[PDB]
């Protein structure tokens, strides 16, 4: 058994106008994180991790994340394939992920060189998850960007305790 805040309908999730795929490349730090399966846990606060986007020849992205867990660096790789409009993607090689029947990415807003907000929705074991990531090119962002992110997450039905600001670290992500 499992209870989840429902995914918003896509009409409520804006799309970055005139998305520039090659400017979105490079390292982004995960400055904010929110979702129906994200919980604020004060006993054990989430550590910052990073995500690198690289354009392949075919204009899919190789997307690599690194996190510091159990005293080591863990890498995971995914392929984002361009969707129906610029700034939208689906997950490549979906059959290689057991349980996963759907996966969508939509870039909500970015200025490419400081901040981005990205929306993810997926269906895993027939359950529907969503998250919003607040990316920064650096590890800190203005109170304004963070409050903007809180507001947007709440507009999608997420209460405060489903919204976390991972703690900046030095291991693995520099
Ligand atoms: N900063 C930056 O790269 N901006 C940009 C580039 C091309 C088109 C639209 C916006
Ligand atoms: N917790 C969590 O990771 N949720 C999630 C992940 C990927 C896509 C959509 C939602
Ligand atoms: Cl990410």
Curated annotation (Swiss-Prot):
Enterobactin binds at residues 103, 131. One of its GO terms (biological process) is negative regulation of hippocampal neuron apoptotic process. A carboxymycobactin binds at residues 49-51, 122, 131, 135. It is found in: Secreted; Cytoplasmic granule lumen; Cytoplasmic vesicle lumen. One of its GO terms (cellular component) is extracellular space. Its main location: secreted. The keyword Disulfide bond applies. Gene3D superfamilies: 2.40.128.20. Glycans are attached at residue 62. Keywords: Apoptosis, Cytoplasmic vesicle, Disulfide bond, Glycoprotein, Immunity, Innate immunity, Ion transport, Iron, Iron transport, Pyrrolidone carboxylic acid, Secreted, Signal, Transport. Induction: Expression is activated by the oncoprotein BCR-ABL; BCR-ABL misregulates expression via the JAK/STAT pathway and binding of STAT5A to the promoter. Induced by insulin. Detected in neutrophils (at protein level). Expressed in bone marrow and in tissues that are prone to exposure to microorganism. High expression is found in bone marrow as well as in uterus, prostate, salivary gland, stomach, appendix, colon, trachea and lung. Expressed in the medullary tubules of the kidney. Not found in the small intestine or peripheral blood leukocytes. Iron-trafficking protein involved in multiple processes such as apoptosis, innate immunity and renal development. Binds iron through association with 2,3-dihydroxybenzoic acid (2,3-DHBA), a siderophore that shares structural similarities with bacterial enterobactin, and delivers or removes iron from the cell, depending on the context. Iron-bound form (holo-24p3) is internalized following binding to the SLC22A17 (24p3R) receptor, leading to release of iron and subsequent increase of intracellular iron concentration. This is Neutrophil gelatinase-associated lipocalin. It comes from Homo sapiens (Human).
């Amino acid at each position: 058994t499992s209870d989840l805040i429902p995914a918003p309908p896509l009409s409520k999730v804006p799309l970055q106008q005139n998305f520039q795929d090659n400017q979105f490349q490079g390292k982004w730090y995960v400055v904010g994180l929110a979702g129906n399966a994200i919980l604020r846990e004060d006993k054990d606060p989430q550590k910052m991790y990073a995500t690198i986007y690289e354009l392949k020849e075919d204009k899919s992205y190789n997307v690599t994340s690194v996190l510091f867990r159990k005293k080591k660096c863990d890498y995971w790789i995914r392929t984002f394939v361009p969707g129906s409009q610029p700034g939208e993607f689906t997950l490549g090689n979906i059959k290689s992920y057991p349980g996963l029947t759907s996966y969508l990415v939509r870039v909500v807003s970015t200025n490419y060189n400081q901040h981005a907000m990205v929306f993810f929705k997926k269906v895993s074991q027939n359950r529907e998850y969503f998250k919003i990531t607040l990316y920064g090119r650096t590890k800190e962002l203005t109170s304004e960007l963070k409050e903007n992110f809180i507001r947007f997450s709440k507009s999608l039905g997420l209460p405060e305790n489903h919204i976390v600001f991972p703690v900046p670290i030095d291991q693995c992500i520099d």
